[PDB]
C-alpha cells in the first residue's frame, strides 16, 4: 500500500514528463508514447535496481531512445536531451553526469549503451514485431 502509493506517484510524474517530451518530439508517430511508457513502467517495476543512485528522467530518456531505435524512427539522443532541458525542473547534469559502473560517471549515452540497453535489450526487441503490443495502462491523472 505505502509502496503502491509511492509507485503510483512515481508513475504519474514519469508519465507526465514522458508525455511532454513525446508531444514535442514524436508529434507524428503518436503510437510510440504508449509503447515507450510500457518499457519505462516495466523498468521501474521490474528492473528497479537501474534506479539505484540514479534519476527517473534518465530511465525516461533511455526508454524513449530505445523504442524509437527498434521502430526505426529517426530520433537522436542529442535531440531528446535538448528537448529535456526545457522541462521546468530540468538540469543538464542529469544527462551529462550519470552513474555508470561502481563510481564511474559518464554521459547518459554511456549509461544507455553500457547499462540500460544491455539490461533491457530483450524487452526492447519485443517491439520489433508487428503483432499488437500488450501495453501498460496509462497512469491516472
Amino acid at each position: 500500500t505505502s509502496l503502491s502509493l509511492f509507485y503510483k506517484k512515481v508513475y504519474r510524474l514519469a508519465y507526465l514528463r514522458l508525455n511532454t517530451l513525446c508531444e514535442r518530439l514524436l508529434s507524428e508517430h503518436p503510437e510510440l508514447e504508449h509503447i515507450i511508457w510500457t518499457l519505462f513502467q516495466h523498468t521501474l517495476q521490474n528492473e528497479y535496481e537501474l534506479m539505484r543512485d540514479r534519476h527517473l528522467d534518465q530511465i525516461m530518456m533511455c526508454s524513449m531512445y530505445g523504442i524509437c531505435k527498434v521502430k526505426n524512427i529517426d530520433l537522436k539522443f542529442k535531440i531528446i536531451v535538448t528537448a529535456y532541458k526545457d522541462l521546468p525542473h530540468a538540469v543538464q547534469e542529469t544527462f551529462k553526469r550519470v552513474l555508470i559502473k561502481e563510481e564511474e560517471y559518464d554521459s547518459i549515452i554511456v549509461f544507455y549503451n553500457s547499462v540500460f540497453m544491455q539490461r533491457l535489450k530483450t524487452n526492447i526487441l519485443q517491439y520489433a514485431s508487428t503483432r499488437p503490443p500488450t501495453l501498460s495502462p496509462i497512469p491516472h491523472i
Binding site: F77, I108, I109, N113, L125
Partner: peptide, 9 residues
C-alpha cells in the same frame, strides 16, 4: 541495432 552512435555535444 539498439546502439547509440552519438557523443554528447
Amino acid at each position: 541495432d539498439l546502439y547509440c552512435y552519438e557523443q554528447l555535444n
